[PDB]
From Swiss-Prot, chain A:
EC id: 3.6.1.13, 3.6.1.58, 2.7.7.96
Residue sites binding Mg(2+) 3 per the record: 99, 103, 153
Pfam family, one: NUDIX
Textual note on the cofactor: Binds 3 Mg(2+) ions per subunit.
Domain Nudix hydrolase, residue spans: 44-184
Protein name as catalogued: ADP-sugar pyrophosphatase
InterPro entries: Nudix_hydrolase, NUDIX_hydrolase-like_dom_sf, NUDIX_hydrolase_CS, NUDIX_hydrolase_dom
Higher taxonomy: Eukaryota, Metazoa, Chordata, Craniata, Vertebrata
Glycyl lysine isopeptide (Lys-Gly) (interchain with G-Cter in SUMO2) cross-link, renumbered residues: 29
Reactions mediated catalytically: D-ribose 5-phosphate + ATP + H(+) = ADP-D-ribose + diphosphate; ADP-D-ribose + H2O = D-ribose 5-phosphate + AMP + 2 H(+); 8-oxo-dGDP + H2O = 8-oxo-dGMP + phosphate + H(+)
Phosphothreonine PTM positions: 32
Organism: Homo sapiens (Human)
Length: 194, 194
């Protein structure tokens, strides 16, 4: 029933733009919405990837590998899955493995790749693939992992046990001013609920 | 180590604004970022998202989701019930209210997250994730009455919690919909648990 009638550019930066979206509502009336988009999306099936990195080691509980970084939009530090935008011509899987290595040092193995999922669909058109990757932490390549951060990238790695993820995130949030990402929290809550 | 120095307004709509954030990188070098913010925040967070656990005896437990046209996305999305927190409303109260408006169901609060970020590389948007159980055997949830506000047109989709990820993948394959990243993350963790 509903569809886009027009998309008017309001303001365009280097990385983000704002649009006035006109669409048809299901009564058959014309309405508008204010829409955010990135300027960087070419033929990628999504803007970015987020990586769910399951660190697996003999005689260890499985860990979920997370990253903590300063996020200028938030004005502070956030804890997130490793993530980055997909380069032009790059597959979501390659992007995931690459970002995981750049941000954490680990070399993962693909497990699964989601369809493109929406980040905040009432506000933006931004999408990611969620890429599950296992990390064989007994491999020598993954012994002493060092991030290879790009220019202006400054990332801390936090590995937390899957079997206590929600409580461990709560204990990090109780100790310092930081925000947990909604996808991480959702993942941690389902682990509890399961 | 890192912090915001200044925020320059680039463009302000009714609902959303774009800013250029200047911040101090950890090397001592000043950098800029293009940031999105809502103009509606007063509150602990911008919004709530509700994880509604529909419990009916002799039935599988279901997660209650909503399908709506999202103008920024140009199409239909499958999401947790959700909306912005009214000025002077608690996140819990927003959760039960939005759940009723969007689904007709009357639930009970199970737990409430701290404010968590939606897309912190792009925006300052935050929500509380509120877990709510719904006694589907109670008379008030027999014929749930969804009360759409002006310009909301919401379909309710209840999926079994135990097969959530496969059921969502199926909707994406058949119905050309976009699943929300938080919903997808929750679904992944249900499978990844134990
Ligand atoms: C309730 C509401 C309605 C429209 C918008 C919009 N972005 O145009 C919003 F962010 C919130
Ligand atoms: Cl529950
Ligand atoms: Mg990143
Ligand atoms: Mg990166
Ligand atoms: Mg809503
Ligand atoms: Mg609503």
């Amino acid at each position: 029933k509903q569809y886009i009638i027009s998309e008017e550019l309001i303001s365009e930066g280097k990385w983000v733009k704002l649009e006035k979206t006109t669409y048809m509502d299901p009564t058959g009336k014309t309405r508008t919405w204010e829409s955010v988009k990135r300027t960087t999306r070419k033929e990628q099936t999504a803007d970015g990837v987020a990586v769910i990195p399951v660190l697996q080691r003999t005689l260890h509980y499985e860990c979920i590998v997370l990253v903590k970084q300063f996020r200028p939009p938030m004005g502070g530090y956030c804890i997130e899955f490793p993530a980055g935008l997909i380069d032009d011509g790059e597959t979501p899987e390659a992007a995931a493995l690459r970002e995981l290595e750049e941000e954490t040092g680990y070399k993962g193995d693909i497990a699964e790749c989601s369809p493109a999922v929406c980040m905040d669909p009432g506000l933006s058109n931004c999408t990611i693939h969620i890429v599950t990757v296992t990390i064989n932490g007994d491999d020598a390549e993954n012994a002493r992992p060092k991030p290879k951060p790009g220019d202006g990238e400054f990332v801390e790695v936090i590995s937390l046990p899957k079997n206590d993820l929600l409580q461990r995130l709560d204990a990090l949030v109780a100790e310092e001013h930081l925000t947990v990402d909604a996808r991480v929290y959702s993942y941690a809550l389902a682990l509890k609920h399961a």
